[PDB]
Structure formats: structure tokens, C-alpha cells
Copies of this chain bind each other. A is one copy, B any other.
Amino acid sequence: KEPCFREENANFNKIFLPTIYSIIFLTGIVGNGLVILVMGYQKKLRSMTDKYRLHLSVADLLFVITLPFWAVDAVANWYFGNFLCKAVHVIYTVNLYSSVLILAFISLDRYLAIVHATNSQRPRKLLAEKVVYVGVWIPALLLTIPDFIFANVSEADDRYICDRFYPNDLWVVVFQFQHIMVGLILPGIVILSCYCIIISKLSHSKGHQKRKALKTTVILILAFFACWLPYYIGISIDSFILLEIIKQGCEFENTVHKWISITEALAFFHCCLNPILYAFL
């Protein structure tokens, strides 16, 4: 009843995923380094949204440093050993959770700036300079413990596959549900609640279109979640497959893994769209 025990990634992933990773690596390096140079070295962070997009650019730069390891592990497989596999996985997790927590924080900042426009200028300073660290980076760093523990390289079938290796499959299901939860649902629920209240409080602000700093952050968050949504659907289906709820054939269990691979490579475009909304607005 074992399935196909994964299939050798289609020969085309292995030229496509390397290509996607390299495009995202180039765009991420150039764009996020330019954002850090302009908005975080020369200190022209004008709004408090540009404070959080600096945090996004730092997280995305950290991830795109390790993206060439993803490309190499796509073409060939892992050569870099165990410590660097752990480093790549914890950096991937830090980016994963920090970016979406930062987006939730930008939604909170927009909610405080629009809805509580009279009295929330002092909470908007603490939330962006002292509370952002303990609400984004500390939760993002505390969720790399499963990757400090389980992210080892398995010397296998002349493969050496760098992945999170768990004692059993229930751990995989639990941690994929945890990823889905604290990376899509709760930050997504917070963002949706903040923006629904913003739209309800802005719908009668005389009509005066306060859709300025709102449109940029709406585009940023919508593009981020559009990049990540197919991957989250794939891993939710995969987690329900592992939980013996989707008892279909092993070929479905392999096509969902292929879906996860391409949609995860395509979800790394979130590291590129923060600088893109500085090229455009």
C-alpha cells in the first residue's frame, strides 16, 4: 500500500524549476537589495507601510540568498550537507511566516490609520517599531524549531534529498496543517477582517477616494496570496491524502506532489512582487 514513494521529478521540472528559481533569485536579489538600499539604508521610508515593506524585503532577500540552493537541489539533489540543509530550511520558514505576518501587520496598520484615524498614530508607531519584531520575527523564528530538528538530508538511492524528515506521517500532516493555518488562515482572516472593516468605514468617508496607500497594499497582499493559493490547495489535498481521507491511487499522490513542486516554485514570486510595486505603484 506504499505509493510510488514519490516519482523522479519529471525531467522538465528539473530545467523549469531551476529556471523559475533563477529568475526569482535574480529579481529578488536586485529588487530587494534596492529596496533595502533605498528604503532602509538611505532612510526614505516615508509611510509606516514602507517600514513593513522593508521587513518584507529583508525576509525576501534572506530567502533569495538560499534560492540557488533550491535550483541546485532541483537539477541535481543536495550536495551541501546537513547544516546547510538546516540553514536553507529555517530561512525558508522564516520567510514563509515573516512575510505573511508582515502583511497582517500592514493590514493592521491600514486599519489603524483609516478606521482609527484620529487617535491611532501612537499605536501605529509602536506597532511598526517595537511590536513588529515580537509579532513577526519572534513567531517566525519560533516556528523554525521543527526545521532546526527535522530538516536533515537523507542519504538514500544516490539521491541525498534535503527535506523535513519526521518520525511518522501524522507529524507531516500536523505540520502541514500548521503551515496552512498560521500561513493562510489566521493571517488571512486578520487581513480580511481589517480590509472589510476598512471598506465599511471608507465606503461612507464622503466618497473621497482614500484608495491610495490602500490600493498599493491591497495589490501587494492580493498578489502574495494569489501566488501562494495553488500551493496551499496542493498541500491541503496532500495532507488529507496522508491522513487516509483521500484514498485515491498512488498516481494521484504523485500528481499532487508534482503540483506542490511547481506551485511552490511559482509561489516564490512573492519575493519579487514587493519591489515590483515600487517599480509600478
In A95-131, which residues have CB < 8 Å from any B CB? none
For the A-B complex with A14-B237, A38-B200 known, give 7 more contacts whose Cβ atoms are closer than 8 Å: A11-B249, A14-B255, A15-B233, A22-B233, A42-B203, A44-B203, A76-B245
Cβ of A28 within 8 Å of any chain B Cβ, yes or no, is no
Q: List chain B residues, Cβ under 8 A from A18.
A: 233, 237
Work out how many copies of this chain go into the complex: 4
A19, B229: Cβ atoms under 8 Å? yes
Majority-rule SS of A interface residues: helix
Contact of A14 among B19, B37, B199, B252 (CB under 8 A): B252
- Does A259 make an interface contact (CB < 8 A)? yes
Residues in B with CB closer than 8 Å to A237 are 14-15, 18, 75
Whether A146 sits at the interface, judged by CB under 8 Å, is no
Do the beta carbons of B199 and A259 come within 8 Å of each other?
no
A181 interface residue per 8 A CB criterion = no
Q: Does A148 contact B (CB under 8 A)?
A: no
Say whether A34 faces chain B, with CB atoms less than 8 Å apart.
Answer: yes
Assess the B203–A75 pair: CB atoms within 8 A.
no
Q: Is the CB of B204 within 8 A of A44?
A: yes
- Given A11-B255, A240-B75, do A200 and B22 touch, yes or no (CB 8 Å)? no
